[PDB]
Amino acid sequence: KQVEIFTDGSALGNPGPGGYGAILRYRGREKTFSAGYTRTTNNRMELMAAAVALEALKEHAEVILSTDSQYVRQGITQWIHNWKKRGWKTADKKPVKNVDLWQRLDAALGQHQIKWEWVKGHAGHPENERADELARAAAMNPTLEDTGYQVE
């Protein structure tokens, strides 16, 4: 009755072609999601992976989401609630970097019960390693445009 989610994102530049990988497991079966983008960043792909995986759930679910992304971890544990208080802007009044994706992720997280597993390394986390392989394979064959990517 719980959904296990494992995500990763990767890009070949800063900005360059990138992609994500997401694996969803529920009631012993798995589903895989992966897509590649022409010009993006590692952080956007790491964040997009989690949003996409949470979007495939079409009803409230109890979720264990495992990701080794430091970026996603800081957003969830330190940044998002402060950014909402400040209307999604930094102190210089610019929109937060990647606000499009943070808002997409935030929408999805507010419908579920999520236990976040912040993993550190591929050893002993085979699904996270597989999600990394998926993301890298998608970066090698991009088909989509990452419309919200902006320089700097």
PDB file of C-alpha atoms in Angstrom:
ATOM      1  CA  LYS A   1       0.000   0.000   0.000  1.00  0.00           C
ATOM      2  CA  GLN A   2       2.959   2.418  -0.131  1.00  0.00           C
ATOM      3  CA  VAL A   3       4.536   3.744  -3.312  1.00  0.00           C
ATOM      4  CA  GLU A   4       8.340   3.661  -3.499  1.00  0.00           C
ATOM      5  CA  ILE A   5       9.814   6.330  -5.779  1.00  0.00           C
ATOM      6  CA  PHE A   6      13.476   6.644  -6.816  1.00  0.00           C
ATOM      7  CA  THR A   7      14.636   9.649  -8.838  1.00  0.00           C
ATOM      8  CA  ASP A   8      17.690  11.182 -10.495  1.00  0.00           C
ATOM      9  CA  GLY A   9      18.534  13.846 -13.082  1.00  0.00           C
ATOM     10  CA  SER A  10      21.711  14.652 -15.030  1.00  0.00           C
ATOM     11  CA  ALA A  11      23.006  17.167 -17.597  1.00  0.00           C
ATOM     12  CA  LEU A  12      26.125  17.162 -19.820  1.00  0.00           C
ATOM     13  CA  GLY A  13      26.768  20.882 -19.464  1.00  0.00           C
ATOM     14  CA  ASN A  14      25.892  24.010 -17.548  1.00  0.00           C
ATOM     15  CA  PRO A  15      23.643  24.264 -19.598  1.00  0.00           C
ATOM     16  CA  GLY A  16      23.733  21.238 -21.923  1.00  0.00           C
ATOM     17  CA  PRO A  17      21.592  18.236 -22.931  1.00  0.00           C
ATOM     18  CA  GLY A  18      20.177  16.448 -19.862  1.00  0.00           C
ATOM     19  CA  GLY A  19      17.478  14.028 -18.756  1.00  0.00           C
ATOM     20  CA  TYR A  20      15.719  12.453 -15.783  1.00  0.00           C
ATOM     21  CA  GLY A  21      14.960   8.946 -14.552  1.00  0.00           C
ATOM     22  CA  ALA A  22      12.152   7.952 -12.180  1.00  0.00           C
ATOM     23  CA  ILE A  23      11.143   4.493 -10.930  1.00  0.00           C
ATOM     24  CA  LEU A  24       7.839   3.937  -9.179  1.00  0.00           C
ATOM     25  CA  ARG A  25       7.110   0.719  -7.296  1.00  0.00           C
ATOM     26  CA  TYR A  26       3.713  -0.241  -5.890  1.00  0.00           C
ATOM     27  CA  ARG A  27       2.181  -3.582  -4.933  1.00  0.00           C
ATOM     28  CA  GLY A  28       5.303  -5.327  -6.189  1.00  0.00           C
ATOM     29  CA  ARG A  29       5.210  -3.872  -9.735  1.00  0.00           C
ATOM     30  CA  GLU A  30       7.268  -1.099 -11.296  1.00  0.00           C
ATOM     31  CA  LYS A  31       6.843   1.720 -13.762  1.00  0.00           C
ATOM     32  CA  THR A  32       9.692   3.766 -15.297  1.00  0.00           C
ATOM     33  CA  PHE A  33       9.705   7.367 -16.586  1.00  0.00           C
ATOM     34  CA  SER A  34      12.542   9.046 -18.486  1.00  0.00           C
ATOM     35  CA  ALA A  35      12.814  12.024 -20.846  1.00  0.00           C
ATOM     36  CA  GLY A  36      15.710  14.061 -22.295  1.00  0.00           C
ATOM     37  CA  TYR A  37      15.913  17.829 -22.825  1.00  0.00           C
ATOM     38  CA  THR A  38      18.050  19.822 -25.281  1.00  0.00           C
ATOM     39  CA  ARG A  39      19.442  22.489 -22.947  1.00  0.00           C
ATOM     40  CA  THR A  40      19.085  22.259 -19.185  1.00  0.00           C
ATOM     41  CA  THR A  41      21.052  21.775 -15.955  1.00  0.00           C
ATOM     42  CA  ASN A  42      21.712  18.974 -13.477  1.00  0.00           C
ATOM     43  CA  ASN A  43      19.701  20.768 -10.807  1.00  0.00           C
ATOM     44  CA  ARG A  44      16.665  21.240 -13.071  1.00  0.00           C
ATOM     45  CA  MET A  45      16.714  17.580 -14.096  1.00  0.00           C
ATOM     46  CA  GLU A  46      17.086  16.415 -10.453  1.00  0.00           C
ATOM     47  CA  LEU A  47      14.070  18.547  -9.502  1.00  0.00           C
ATOM     48  CA  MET A  48      12.002  17.672 -12.597  1.00  0.00           C
ATOM     49  CA  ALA A  49      12.479  13.962 -11.893  1.00  0.00           C
ATOM     50  CA  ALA A  50      10.769  14.260  -8.525  1.00  0.00           C
ATOM     51  CA  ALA A  51       7.945  16.437  -9.842  1.00  0.00           C
ATOM     52  CA  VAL A  52       7.238  14.018 -12.738  1.00  0.00           C
ATOM     53  CA  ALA A  53       7.262  10.975 -10.470  1.00  0.00           C
ATOM     54  CA  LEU A  54       4.834  12.613  -8.022  1.00  0.00           C
ATOM     55  CA  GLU A  55       2.605  13.622 -10.955  1.00  0.00           C
ATOM     56  CA  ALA A  56       2.011  10.032 -12.081  1.00  0.00           C
ATOM     57  CA  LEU A  57       0.150   9.379  -8.806  1.00  0.00           C
ATOM     58  CA  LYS A  58      -3.520  10.139  -9.492  1.00  0.00           C
ATOM     59  CA  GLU A  59      -4.929  10.082  -5.943  1.00  0.00           C
ATOM     60  CA  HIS A  60      -3.556  10.667  -2.435  1.00  0.00           C
ATOM     61  CA  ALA A  61      -0.795   8.143  -1.709  1.00  0.00           C
ATOM     62  CA  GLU A  62       1.633   7.224   1.052  1.00  0.00           C
ATOM     63  CA  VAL A  63       5.019   7.668  -0.635  1.00  0.00           C
ATOM     64  CA  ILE A  64       8.696   6.954   0.197  1.00  0.00           C
ATOM     65  CA  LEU A  65      10.719   9.118  -2.173  1.00  0.00           C
ATOM     66  CA  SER A  66      14.421   8.335  -2.384  1.00  0.00           C
ATOM     67  CA  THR A  67      16.776  10.779  -4.098  1.00  0.00           C
ATOM     68  CA  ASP A  68      20.475  11.617  -3.743  1.00  0.00           C
ATOM     69  CA  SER A  69      19.883  15.218  -4.902  1.00  0.00           C
ATOM     70  CA  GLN A  70      21.331  17.759  -2.483  1.00  0.00           C
ATOM     71  CA  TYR A  71      19.351  20.402  -4.380  1.00  0.00           C
ATOM     72  CA  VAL A  72      16.010  18.690  -3.784  1.00  0.00           C
ATOM     73  CA  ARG A  73      17.002  18.063  -0.151  1.00  0.00           C
ATOM     74  CA  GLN A  74      17.776  21.741   0.561  1.00  0.00           C
ATOM     75  CA  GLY A  75      14.549  22.853  -1.143  1.00  0.00           C
ATOM     76  CA  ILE A  76      12.381  20.473   0.897  1.00  0.00           C
ATOM     77  CA  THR A  77      14.184  20.819   4.207  1.00  0.00           C
ATOM     78  CA  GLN A  78      15.340  24.433   4.146  1.00  0.00           C
ATOM     79  CA  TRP A  79      14.129  26.631   1.295  1.00  0.00           C
ATOM     80  CA  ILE A  80      10.574  26.122   0.071  1.00  0.00           C
ATOM     81  CA  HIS A  81       8.694  27.227   3.223  1.00  0.00           C
ATOM     82  CA  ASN A  82      10.783  30.399   3.491  1.00  0.00           C
ATOM     83  CA  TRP A  83      10.401  31.128  -0.213  1.00  0.00           C
ATOM     84  CA  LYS A  84       6.585  30.882   0.127  1.00  0.00           C
ATOM     85  CA  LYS A  85       6.667  33.426   2.981  1.00  0.00           C
ATOM     86  CA  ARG A  86       8.647  35.815   0.773  1.00  0.00           C
ATOM     87  CA  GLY A  87       6.439  35.302  -2.300  1.00  0.00           C
ATOM     88  CA  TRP A  88       8.951  33.157  -4.189  1.00  0.00           C
ATOM     89  CA  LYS A  89      11.596  35.852  -4.440  1.00  0.00           C
ATOM     90  CA  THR A  90      15.121  36.274  -3.086  1.00  0.00           C
ATOM     91  CA  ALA A  91      16.169  39.319  -1.032  1.00  0.00           C
ATOM     92  CA  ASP A  92      17.026  41.212  -4.199  1.00  0.00           C
ATOM     93  CA  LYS A  93      13.371  40.679  -5.293  1.00  0.00           C
ATOM     94  CA  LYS A  94      14.218  38.380  -8.219  1.00  0.00           C
ATOM     95  CA  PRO A  95      12.104  35.237  -8.672  1.00  0.00           C
ATOM     96  CA  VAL A  96      13.790  32.221  -7.113  1.00  0.00           C
ATOM     97  CA  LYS A  97      15.950  30.245  -9.503  1.00  0.00           C
ATOM     98  CA  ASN A  98      13.916  27.436 -11.059  1.00  0.00           C
ATOM     99  CA  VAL A  99      10.705  28.721  -9.466  1.00  0.00           C
ATOM    100  CA  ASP A 100       8.711  27.051 -12.276  1.00  0.00           C
ATOM    101  CA  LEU A 101       9.955  23.631 -11.194  1.00  0.00           C
ATOM    102  CA  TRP A 102       9.851  24.307  -7.475  1.00  0.00           C
ATOM    103  CA  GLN A 103       6.210  25.395  -7.831  1.00  0.00           C
ATOM    104  CA  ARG A 104       5.459  22.255  -9.932  1.00  0.00           C
ATOM    105  CA  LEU A 105       7.063  20.062  -7.281  1.00  0.00           C
ATOM    106  CA  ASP A 106       5.275  21.867  -4.450  1.00  0.00           C
ATOM    107  CA  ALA A 107       1.885  21.332  -6.101  1.00  0.00           C
ATOM    108  CA  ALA A 108       2.523  17.604  -6.370  1.00  0.00           C
ATOM    109  CA  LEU A 109       3.878  17.163  -2.793  1.00  0.00           C
ATOM    110  CA  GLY A 110       0.831  18.850  -1.234  1.00  0.00           C
ATOM    111  CA  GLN A 111      -1.462  15.972  -2.292  1.00  0.00           C
ATOM    112  CA  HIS A 112       0.496  13.082  -0.665  1.00  0.00           C
ATOM    113  CA  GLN A 113       2.130  11.809   2.540  1.00  0.00           C
ATOM    114  CA  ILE A 114       5.826  11.691   1.695  1.00  0.00           C
ATOM    115  CA  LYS A 115       8.721  10.263   3.632  1.00  0.00           C
ATOM    116  CA  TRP A 116      11.875  11.603   1.973  1.00  0.00           C
ATOM    117  CA  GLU A 117      14.934   9.334   1.893  1.00  0.00           C
ATOM    118  CA  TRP A 118      18.022  11.449   1.238  1.00  0.00           C
ATOM    119  CA  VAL A 119      20.503   8.887  -0.108  1.00  0.00           C
ATOM    120  CA  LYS A 120      24.218   9.616  -0.464  1.00  0.00           C
ATOM    121  CA  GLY A 121      26.042   7.277  -2.927  1.00  0.00           C
ATOM    122  CA  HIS A 122      25.040   4.518  -5.372  1.00  0.00           C
ATOM    123  CA  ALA A 123      26.440   1.688  -3.258  1.00  0.00           C
ATOM    124  CA  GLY A 124      23.536  -0.171  -1.669  1.00  0.00           C
ATOM    125  CA  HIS A 125      20.927   1.933  -3.511  1.00  0.00           C
ATOM    126  CA  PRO A 126      20.430  -0.007  -6.751  1.00  0.00           C
ATOM    127  CA  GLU A 127      17.262   1.758  -7.853  1.00  0.00           C
ATOM    128  CA  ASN A 128      18.943   5.139  -7.427  1.00  0.00           C
ATOM    129  CA  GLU A 129      21.844   3.887  -9.567  1.00  0.00           C
ATOM    130  CA  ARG A 130      19.327   2.674 -12.159  1.00  0.00           C
ATOM    131  CA  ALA A 131      17.576   6.084 -12.109  1.00  0.00           C
ATOM    132  CA  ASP A 132      20.979   7.703 -12.752  1.00  0.00           C
ATOM    133  CA  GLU A 133      21.533   5.364 -15.727  1.00  0.00           C
ATOM    134  CA  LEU A 134      18.097   6.299 -17.107  1.00  0.00           C
ATOM    135  CA  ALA A 135      18.784  10.016 -16.737  1.00  0.00           C
ATOM    136  CA  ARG A 136      22.161   9.770 -18.458  1.00  0.00           C
ATOM    137  CA  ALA A 137      20.705   7.690 -21.310  1.00  0.00           C
ATOM    138  CA  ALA A 138      17.971  10.301 -21.836  1.00  0.00           C
ATOM    139  CA  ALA A 139      20.576  13.105 -21.901  1.00  0.00           C
ATOM    140  CA  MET A 140      22.243  11.288 -24.765  1.00  0.00           C
ATOM    141  CA  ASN A 141      18.979  11.346 -26.758  1.00  0.00           C
ATOM    142  CA  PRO A 142      17.058  14.519 -25.931  1.00  0.00           C
ATOM    143  CA  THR A 143      13.711  15.167 -27.614  1.00  0.00           C
ATOM    144  CA  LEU A 144      12.122  17.879 -25.513  1.00  0.00           C
ATOM    145  CA  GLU A 145      12.639  21.553 -24.836  1.00  0.00           C
ATOM    146  CA  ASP A 146      13.105  22.630 -21.200  1.00  0.00           C
ATOM    147  CA  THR A 147      11.004  25.762 -21.634  1.00  0.00           C
ATOM    148  CA  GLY A 148      11.609  27.305 -18.202  1.00  0.00           C
ATOM    149  CA  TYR A 149      15.419  27.129 -18.306  1.00  0.00           C
ATOM    150  CA  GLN A 150      16.987  30.593 -18.098  1.00  0.00           C
ATOM    151  CA  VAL A 151      20.678  31.610 -18.104  1.00  0.00           C
ATOM    152  CA  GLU A 152      22.213  32.366 -14.701  1.00  0.00           C
TER     153      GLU A 152
END
